[PDB]
RNA sequence: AGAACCUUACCAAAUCUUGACAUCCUUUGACAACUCUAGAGAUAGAGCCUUCCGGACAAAGUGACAGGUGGUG
RNA sequence: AAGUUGGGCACUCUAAGUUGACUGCCGGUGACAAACCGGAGGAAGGUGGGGAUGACGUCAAAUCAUCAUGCCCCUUAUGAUUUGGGCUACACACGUGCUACAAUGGACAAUACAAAGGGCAGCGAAACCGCGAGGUCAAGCAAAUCCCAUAAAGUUGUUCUCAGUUCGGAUUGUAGUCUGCAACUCGACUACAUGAAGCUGGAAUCGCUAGUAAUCGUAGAUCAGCAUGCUACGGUGAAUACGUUC
């Protein structure tokens, strides 16, 4: 077995993130990441820890996420990466933080306001 | 009502004062309120007096009146 | 300008006056209330009602009446309370049991003294003597803090103003603060006369 | 067989301490409980125009949150069913038993 | 009426070229938040000017906004002239870069965008004209500075 | 030429059937399914056989003049019974209830200011 | 409202599409909720009185 | 935070005057959904006819009185 | 076939209780101060992001048409009932918006990813009928269970090739669906045809500093029916802020 198990979110996203010995394979809700992720540059954000780790496809990765679309799916999916690989080795910490990975982006969608188009944008105004 | 499997509609006592005195030949002027009331080909060849707010307009059927409503013929507005 | 002081903090330090759920006649319930609140108020205005709390369940309305005189609501015999229970069972198809709780300080009682000087008002006493009296003796009755306020035609004046006074602390942005706020409405010859108080009585 | 019992109330102090006085009667009782499971709260938003006329941009938004709790009984006894009908919870609280 | 200067942002490096130039560039392009169509705007349009030119897409890329960065500038307040940035250089470059592309005349933004880098890596397009016409009105200004 | 109406000679065949004043797109698909011809097939490479075709289905579906004097014989007709949807005919105005007060520039020509 | 406008409301319509909703406490005929058979104002100041169950200002 | 009717406060026409709605006072009920006729309806004409416990309740008459989205923010 | 059921509460999640962020620690600038800047740690760093919360006062600002109320006024009418018509008019001027003028696009076919709400005579699954909006039968569901309800933008393929057009969809004809006693004045939607201006807008002028603007859809109150408005939700997701002369 040896599975690294692990969480990651961003935006309304959430993926459980489940790495074990492998060739570098990625699969995301029984679907290849190339075929779920509608761009490569998600693929290589995917990676990016990875890299940052030195461990670049010596794991598989199997993914269970939801919520939000897909850029929000894909680093909630880095995140749980990052995760799992802090578990799998504590060492890979200070790598992670310096790359920037371990933080879960707190930004969310800001609610709207009673008398506005939008969170900040308001009406058009007219003097007279 | 409108809907084809709803027959054209009419109020039933429109309907009845025209079947009313439809024999004899010497057919009179019929008050009415309904602007809603379809025509139907047995209007033709009458006179009803419409109330379109403050009086009663007298209308004409003929056989191109079929089909449309009473109130298209007794305007409501007026402009210049 | 101000928000209601209850109304702030109504759900937060503060409880609902009424204490029920209901789902489908929701409506019918709120409105059963509200005509059982208006007819004790109207039946029980020389009573110092302070204010009431309405529960139901089983088929039953729990009613509870804090006032400032139990005597008077209650009756020497309990002929009062039980004449107040027959009409509100009259009223409403279902059973009301009714408690009466006695409120030891009127003085500390934003709605009995809201009531007591807007009666003093339509008995044309002075609108700042009034004032001046009512936030002496509910600070000497330890309330750490007082505000009255009365608003319109004053002395029967053609030009509606409003003069509020204090003392010591009534801080209304403080959610934490527990403020009785009361607004009453004297009926003056001359027209509508607004009375509002704020106590602070202090942490609890 | 298991009973259900669904407590839905708007303070969630008050169903809290509902669902803590059920579980402890039926634990006295002997059934043996699953729960509490606090199921999603409703909220339902009221979004009012603050001012009596016009100031259309001025609003005030209430709410009303009704919390919701799951009780389960497994081994159900005579005993453990006349405790739970005969318990008497805060009228705030709105209980309904699922045999 | 303004406390100070505040933190400015900074860009990721494009993902294939590592260039945070190159990512600034699709942002430019990308318009309503369709990051997607930017990028394959700007991928087919660096295919097209490397098949044309024989020559390192980014090399000419950089020629590029090397030819179109401006030096001076020239503010109202009559016109006073004054210097320009880096940072001001690479945006005013890239936007120009992209405004005059979107002017072109060909006939599908790819194309625009490759045919507007070759004019200015060659030093004969309309952001090469925009900076020429910069310059020109601050040394006529020079004056005032 | 079809309904004695010429047809752009470069378009698809179905595209520029619509040319023809009563076709438009779902007809001109109909009519293109019915006389078996190929979708993309630009009408200058087309054959004798199926311009006949597409003119015999053609000539049934009343487009052209035939449709001309049919809506205006319902204009006039609606105009002359002195009808609600007449009278607003005869003063140019929106005859389905649209308001008048504004946005009424396609029925009452420019801004007269 | 008016009185008689109410007492109309109130009495059983001929026509069953010419029903309206009016606030229960005051009259008015705009913006009455169905839940509580109120209008915006009653239920603000009822809301502030603590009159409603569960009823409290919202925020998030 | 919902003008075809209703809403609706405006207009035309057909209609009522203790009144569409509330309390008191005299009589006392079988009131009233329901069916017929005449009316655009609101309403009027005879039936049918079904309720009710010292009294809730509900009809008819009269006088107090009702009513106003009328004015003055 | 399906987390569908047997089983489990690991994970996610749900919702109660708790921990967490305080310039706390380190180094500089600073009058050893406040504070500012940078760093470590931390998910989060400088009131982390937003909401509610609006002092003493100004404008005899708004509201007597939510409600209440002094005074004045009408009472065979300024009160009351009903049917029909106004509030929807239309030589015109202004505000706020929706849709476009196209190739960062139009059309066709295939295929993914949300959040937040509503449902009792209400949400109406599947099936059948109609090209269609919809109609018949009708399961489940008073709700983390069923339904509303397949989100769109996107991705991948074919076509159009810069053309007032395969753009744009007003306007009008005809024929229908649904609600409602009743869509003429005066509802929404659907099918066929019709195919207007408009090819990025003068003087001027508005919003917005980050998950913001911009774009894309989604839900709800009112509500028989009727939303480009309002109130909420999320997907993708920027540019710039030198500075205080004006
Ligand atoms: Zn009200």
């Known amino acids: 077995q040896v599975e ?125 | 009502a409108r809907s084809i499997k709803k027959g054209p509609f009419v109020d039933e006592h429109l309907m ?30 009458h006179t009803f007096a419409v109330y379109d707010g403050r009086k009663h307009v007298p209308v004409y059927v003929t056989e191109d009146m079929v089909g449309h409503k009473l109130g298209e013929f007794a305007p409501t507005r007026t402009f210049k | 300008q101000k928000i209601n002081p209850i109304g702030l903090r109504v759900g937060i330090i503060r409880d609902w006056e009424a204490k029920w759920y209901a789902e489908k006649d929701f409506a019918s319930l709120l409105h059963e209330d509200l005509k059982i609140r208006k007819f004790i108020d109207n039946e029980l205005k020389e009573a110092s009602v302070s204010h009431v709390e309405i529960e139901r369940a089983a ?91 009365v608003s319109g035609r004053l002395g029967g004046a053609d030009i509606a103003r409003a003069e509020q006074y204090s003392e010591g602390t009534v801080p209304l942005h403080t959610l934490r603060a527990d403020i009785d706020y009361a607004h009453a409405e004297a009926d003056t010859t001359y027209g509508k006369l607004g009375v509002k108080v704020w106590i602070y ?4 | 067989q298991k009973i259900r019992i669904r407590l839905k109330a708007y303070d969630h102090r008050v169903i809290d301490q509902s669902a803590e006085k059920i579980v402890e009667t039926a634990k006295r009782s002997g059934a043996d409980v699953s729960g509490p499971i606090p199921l999603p709260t409703e909220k339902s938003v009221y979004t009012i125009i603050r001012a009596v006329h016009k100031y259309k941009d001025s609003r005030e938004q209430f709410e009303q949150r009704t919390h919701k709790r799951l009780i389960d009984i497994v081994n159900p006894t005579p005993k453990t069913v006349d405790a739970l009908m005969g318990l008497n919870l805060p009228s705030g609280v709105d209980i309904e038993i699922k045999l | ?66 030819n179109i960065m401006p030096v001076l500038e020239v503010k109202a307040r009559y016109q006073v002239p004054v ?63 | 030429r079809i309904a004695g109406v010429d047809i752009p000679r470069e378009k698809r065949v179905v595209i520029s059937l619509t040319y023809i004043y009563g076709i438009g797109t779902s007809t001109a698909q109909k009519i293109l399914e019915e006389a078996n011809v190929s979708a993309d097939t630009r009408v200058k490479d087309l054959t004798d056989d199926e311009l006949g075709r597409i003119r015999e289905v053609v000539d049934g579906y009343k487009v052209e003049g035939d449709l001309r004097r049919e809506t205006n014989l319902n204009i006039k007709r609606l105009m002359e019974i002195s009808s609600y949807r007449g009278i607003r005919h005869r003063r140019g105005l929106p005859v389905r209830g649209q308001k008048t007060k504004n946005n009424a520039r396609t029925r009452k020509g420019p801004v007269k200011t | 409202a008016k009185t008689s406008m109410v007492a109309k409301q109130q009495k059983k319509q001929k026509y069953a599409v010419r029903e309206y909703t009016r606030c229960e406490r005051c009259g008015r005929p705009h913006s009455v909720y169905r839940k509580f058979k109120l209008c915006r104002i009653c239920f603000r100041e009822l809301a502030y009185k603590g009159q409603i169950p569960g009823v409290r200002k919202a925020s998030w």
Do not use: C
């Open chain 3, 201 to 204: 009585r202090g942490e609890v």
């Open chain 3, 59 to 149: 088929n039953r309305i729990n009613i509870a009446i804090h006032t400032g005189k139990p005597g008077m609501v209650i009756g020497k015999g309990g002929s009062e309370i039980e004449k107040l229970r027959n009409k509100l069972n009259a009223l409403t198809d279902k059973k009301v049991h009714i408690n009466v709780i006695e409120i030891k300080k009127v003085d500390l009682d934003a709605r009995l003294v809201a009531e007591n000087i807007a009666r003093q008002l339509e008995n044309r006493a002075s609108f700042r003597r009034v004032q001046k009296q009512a936030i002496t003796r509910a600070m000497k009755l330890g309330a750490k803090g007082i505000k009255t306020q």
């Open chain 5, 1 to 66: 009426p303004r406390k100070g200067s505040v933190p400015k942002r900074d860009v990721l490096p494009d993902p294939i070229h590592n260039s945070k130039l190159v990512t600034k560039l699709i942002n430019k392009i990308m318009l309503d938040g369709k990051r997607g169509t930017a990028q394959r705007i700007l991928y087919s349009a660096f295919d097209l000017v490397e098949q044309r030119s024989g020559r390192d897409a980014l090399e000419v890329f950089e020629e590029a906004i090397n």
């Open chain 5, 83 to 145: 210097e320009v940035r880096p940072e001001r250089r690479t945006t005013l470059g890239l936007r120009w870069l992209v405004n005059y592309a979107r002017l072109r005349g060909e006939k599908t933004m790819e194309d625009r965008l490759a045919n507007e880098i070759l004019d200015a890596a060659n030093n004969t397009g309309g952001a090469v004209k925009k900076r020429e016409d910069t310059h020109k009105m601050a040394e006529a200004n020079k004056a005032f500075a």
């Open chain 1, 4 to 128: 690294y198990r692990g969480t990651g979110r961003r935006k309304n996203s959430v993926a459980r993130v489940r790495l074990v010995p492998g060739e570098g394979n990625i699969t995301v809700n029984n679907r290849d990441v190339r075929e779920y992720l509608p761009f490569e540059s998600l693929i290589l954000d995917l990676n990016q820890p990875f890299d940052v780790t030195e461990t670049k496809g010596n794991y598989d990765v199997l993914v269970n996420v939801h919520g939000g679309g897909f850029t929000g799916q894909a680093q909630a999916i880095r995140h749980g990466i990052a995760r799992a690989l802090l578990e799998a080795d504590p060492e890979y910490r200070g790598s992670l933080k310096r790359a920037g990975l371990l933080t879960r982006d707190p930004r969310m969608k800001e609610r709207k306001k009673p008398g506005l188009k939008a969170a900040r944008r308001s009406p058009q105004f007219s003097k007279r």
């Open chain 2, 16 to 45: 009845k004062k025209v079947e009313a005195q439809e024999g004899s030949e010497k057919k009179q002027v019929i008050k009415t309120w309904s602007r809603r009331s379809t025509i139907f080909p047995n209007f033709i060849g």
